[PDB]
Amino acid sequence: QAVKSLFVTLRRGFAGTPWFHRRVLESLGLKYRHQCVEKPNNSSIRGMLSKVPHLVVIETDRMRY
């Protein structure tokens, strides 16, 4: 039941978003809406994701399977 990775999907856009949330979304590797990337589970990725929880849809690899 160990969370090996996370799957992060944009549900919002880039327009109207402040530049620092925009930079966090850039460094997560998300560019377009409805785009899902697979991210590791370490404290760096979790810090990036906790900065922007209202713009993304996070899900566990087991959940996505």
Partner RNA sequence: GGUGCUCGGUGAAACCGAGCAUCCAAUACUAAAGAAACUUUACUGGCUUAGUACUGGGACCCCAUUUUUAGUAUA
Instruction: State the binding site.
Output: 15
Based on the shown chain and the rule CB under 7 A, indicate whether residue 22 belongs to the binding site for RNA. no
CB of 44 to RNA, least distance (A): 17
Give the residue, chosen from 14, 21, 60, 61, that forms a contact with RNA under the rule CB under 7 A: 21
CA quadruple 19, 21, 25, 28: dihedral sign: positive
**Is-contact 62 31, C-beta < 8 A?**
no
Based on the shown chain and the rule CB under 8 A, indicate whether residue 16 belongs to the binding site for other proteins. no
CA-only gyration radius of the chain, Å: 11
Out of other proteins, Mg ion, RNA, none, which partner does residue 13 contact, by CB within 5 to 8 A per kind? Answer: Mg ion
